[PDB]
Design a protein around this ligand. Structure first.
Ligand code: ATP
Ligand code: ADP
Ligand code: ADP
Ligand code: MG
Ligand code: MG
Lengths: 45, 242, 77, 48, 49, 48, 49
C-alpha cells in the first residue's frame, strides 16, 4: 500500500509540475528554479 | 531477299464490320455496317484535323466490341427489369424489340466523343443525325459516382460542378475518362498545360477507391526525365544480364 | 475554378503548418469580391495576354505567382 | 447540317491561319531588314 | 559583394524575397550581365537560413 | 495467307508492310493459329 | 555580447550570422516550451535532447 502511493505522488507531481518561465528583456521567456527542479529529480530517483 | 514482302495498305473495313456485327447477334448487321463504315469515313474527312484523332480500323474494332458488350448489358437490364415487373421474359421478342441502332450510336458516343475538341462535338452530332436519323444519345447519369466525386472534391478543396454550373465540364471529362478506362486499357489525356487532367484522374481514382472498395495505387513516371535505358531496362553487353 | 480552389486552401490550410488561420480567413473575405468572374483579376489577366513578355505567357504561372505573394502578404500581416 | 459548308469552313480556317502566319513572318522579315527589330532564333532560321 | 541600391534593384529584391520566402521556384530572365545573380545573392543575405 | 504460305513453302520469311492499323501482326498471328503454331510477338527496338 | 555591441558585426560577420541562426533556433525552442510549460510536454518534444 505504501509503494503505490509513492507512485501516485510522483505521478501527480510530474503531471502538475511546470517549468518556471519569466520574461528576459522582452526578447524571450527564460527558465529559473534550476535548484528546486534538480532536487526534486534527485529525491524522486 | 530472305523475306517475301506483301503490301497491306487498305483493309476491307466494311466486310469486317458486317461479319463482326453478324457474329455478335445483330439482326441488322448489314445496314449497321453500311452506316458505320461510311460514318467513320465522314468523320475522317469532315472533322477538324487534330494530332490526337484516329478513325482507323482499331477505332472501328473498339466501337464494334463495345457495341456488342453494351448490347449484352441492355439484354441483361431488360431481363432484370421485366423480372422485377412481371413474368413475360422470352428471348424472341426481346431480341426483336431491341434498339440496335441506338446501341451502335451509344458505343460511338462513348468511344469517340471524349477525344473531340469543343467545336467538333456539334459536327459529330450532325454527322450522327445525317447518317443515323431519329436516333438520340442519352448518356447515363452515374449517380453514386457523382456523389463520390462531390465528396472527393470537397475533401481536397476542388470545385465540383454539374450541368452548366461552374465545374460541369471538368466533371463531364472525369466521367468520360472513367468510361474510356472501362473500355480501354490504354489512356491518353490530351490537352494544354493546366487543363485539369491531373486533378481529374486523381479525383476519379479516389472516387473509385471510395465507391468500389478496392484501393487504387498510382505510379507516376516521367518518361523523358530519365533515359530510355533507365525507363525500360538494359541488357549487359558483357555478362548478358538483364 | 482556380480562384475558388485558392480561396478554399487559404481559408483551410494554415501557412505555418489559430491566429494565422483567422488572418487567412479575413484576407480571403476581403479578396473575395476581386476573385470573381469579370473581376479586377480576370480583366487584368485578359489584358496581360495582349502584352509582350520575355517568355510565352501562361495563365497558371501568373496565378501561382499572385497566390504565392498573397500568402506572403498574409505572413506580413 | 451542310457537309459542303463544313468542308469550306475547315478550309477557310486553315487558310486564314496560314495567311496570318505567313504575313506576320514576312512583316517580321521586312522589319528586320530595315534594322528596326533585332533578329531572333526563329527569325534567324527563317532568314537562313 | 557590394550592391548600390537602385529602383529596379530594390523592386527585384522585394519580389525575390516574397517569392523565395515560401520556397517557390522561380527564374530570373534577362541579358547577360544584367545583375540577376547579384540580385539573387543580395536577396539571400536577407534569408540567413 | 497466300503470300505467307508461298514464302513458307520456299522456306522464306514473311514481311507484310504498310501503314499502321491494317492488321498485319493480327494477320500473321491468325495464320499461325490457323496452322496450330506457337506465335510469339516481339516488339523490336534499337536494343534488340 | 553579440547584439549589444554593434562593432562585432564588422569584425565577425560570419560569427554573427552563425550565432543569429542558433539564436533563432533557440528562440523557436523557447516559444515551443512557453506554449506548453508542462515539464513532460517539453520532454516529449520530438528530438529535444
Ligand atoms: N476542378 C478544379 N477546380 C478547381 N481547381 C482545380 C480544378 N482542377 C484543377 N484545379 C487546380 O488548377 C490547377 C490545374 O492543375 P492540374 O494538375 O489539374 O493541371 P494539368 O492539366 O494536369 O497540368 P499539366 O498538364 O500542365 O501538368 C492546379 O492548381 C489545381 O489545383
Ligand atoms: N545596382 C548595382 N549595384 C552595384 N553593382 C551593379 C548593380 N547593377 C549591376 N551591377 C554590376 O553588374 C554586374 C552584374 O553581373 P552578374 O550579376 O554576374 O550578371 P548575371 O546576373 O547575368 O550573371 C555585377 O558585376 C555588378 O557589379
Ligand atoms: N480481317 C480482320 N478482321 C477483323 N479485325 C481485324 C482484321 N484485320 C485487322 N483487324 C483489327 O485491327 C486491329 C489492329 O490490327 P494490327 O494487326 O494491330 O495492325 P498493325 O498491322 O498496325 O499491327 C486489331 O485489333 C484487329 O482486331
Ligand atoms: Mg498536369
Ligand atoms: Mg503490329
Amino acid at each position: 500500500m505504501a509503494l503505490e502511493e509513492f507512485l501516485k505522488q510522483i505521478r501527480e507531481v510530474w503531471n502538475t509540475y511546470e517549468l518556471d518561465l519569466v520574461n528576459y528583456q522582452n526578447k524571450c521567456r527564460l527558465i529559473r528554479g534550476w535548484d528546486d527542479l534538480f532536487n526534486k529529480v534527485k529525491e524522486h530517483i | 531477299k530472305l523475306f517475301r514482302s506483301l503490301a497491306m495498305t487498305k483493309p476491307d473495313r466494311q466486310l469486317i464490320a458486317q461479319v463482326m456485327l453478324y457474329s455478335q447477334g445483330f439482326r441488322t448487321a448489314e445496314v449497321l455496317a453500311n452506316k458505320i463504315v461510311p460514318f467513320f469515313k465522314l468523320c475522317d474527312e469532315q472533322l477538324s484535323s487534330q494530332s490526337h484523332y484516329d478513325f482507323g480500323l482499331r477505332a472501328l474494332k473498339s466501337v464494334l466490341v463495345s457495341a456488342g458488350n453494351v448490347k449484352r448489358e441492355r439484354i441483361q437490364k431488360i431481363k432484370r427489369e421485366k423480372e422485377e415487373r412481371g413474368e413475360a421474359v422470352d428471348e424472341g421478342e426481346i431480341a426483336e424489340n431491341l434498339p440496335e441502332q441506338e446501341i451502335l450510336i451509344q458505343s460511338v458516343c462513348e468511344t469517340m466523343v471524349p477525344k473531340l475538341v469543343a467545336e467538333d462535338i456539334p459536327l459529330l452530332f450532325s454527322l450522327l443525325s445525317d447518317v443515323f436519323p431519329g436516333v438520340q444519345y442519352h448518356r447515363g447519369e452515374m449517380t453514386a459516382l457523382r456523389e463520390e466525386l462531390k465528396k472527393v472534391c470537397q475533401e481536397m478543396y476542388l470545385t465540383y460542378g454539374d450541368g452548366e454550373e461552374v465545374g460541369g465540364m471538368w466533371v463531364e471529362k472525369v466521367l468520360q475518362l472513367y468510361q474510356i478506362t472501362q473500355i480501354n486499357h490504354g489512356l491518353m489525356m490530351v490537352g494544354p498545360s493546366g487543363s485539369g487532367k491531373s486533378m481529374a484522374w486523381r479525383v476519379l481514382l479516389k472516387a473509385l477507391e471510395r465507391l468500389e472498395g478496392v484501393e487504387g495505387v498510382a505510379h507516376i513516371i516521367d518518361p523523358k526525365a530519365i533515359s530510355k535505358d533507365h525507363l525500360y531496362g538494359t541488357l549487359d553487353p558483357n555478362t548478358r544480364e538483364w | 475554378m482556380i480562384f475558388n480552389n485558392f480561396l478554399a486552401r487559404l481559408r483551410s490550410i494554415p501557412l505555418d503548418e489559430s491566429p494565422m488561420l483567422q488572418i487567412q480567413r479575413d484576407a480571403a473575405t476581403i479578396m473575395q469580391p476581386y476573385f470573381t468572374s469579370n473581376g479586377l483579376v480576370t480583366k487584368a489577366l485578359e489584358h496581360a495576354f495582349q502584352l509582350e513578355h520575355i517568355m510565352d505567357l501562361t495563365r497558371l504561372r501568373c496565378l501561382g505567382s499572385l497566390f504565392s505573394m498573397l500568402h506572403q502578404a498574409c505572413r506580413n500581416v | 447540317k451542310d457537309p459542303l459548308f463544313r468542308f469550306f469552313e475547315r478550309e477557310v480556317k486553315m487558310g486564314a491561319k496560314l495567311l496570318q502566319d505567313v504575313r506576320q513572318d514576312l512583316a517580321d522579315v521586312v522589319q528586320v531588314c530595315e534594322g528596326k527589330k533585332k533578329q531572333t532564333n526563329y527569325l534567324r532560321t527563317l532568314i537562313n | 559583394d557590394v550592391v548600390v541600391p537602385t529602383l529596379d534593384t530594390v523592386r527585384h529584391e522585394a519580389l525575390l524575397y516574397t517569392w523565395l520566402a515560401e520556397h517557390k521556384p522561380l527564374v530570373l530572365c534577362g541579358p547577360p550581365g544584367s545583375g540577376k545573380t547579384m540580385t539573387l545573392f543580395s536577396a539571400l543575405r536577407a534569408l540567413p537560413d | 495467307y497466300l503470300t505467307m504460305t508461298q514464302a513458307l513453302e520456299a522456306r522464306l520469311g514473311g514481311s507484310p508492310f504498310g501503314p499502321a492499323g491494317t492488321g498485319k501482326t493480327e494477320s500473321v498471328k491468325a495464320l499461325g493459329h490457323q496452322l496450330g503454331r506457337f506465335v510469339l510477338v516481339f516488339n523490336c527496338d534499337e536494343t534488340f | 555580447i553579440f547584439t549589444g555591441s554593434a562593432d562585432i558585426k564588422h569584425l565577425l560577420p560570419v560569427e554573427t550570422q552563425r550565432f543569429q541562426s542558433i539564436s533563432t533556433e533557440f528562440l523557436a525552442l523557447m516559444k515551443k516550451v512557453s506554449k506548453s510549460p508542462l515539464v513532460m510536454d517539453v520532454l516529449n518534444i520530438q528530438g529535444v535532447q
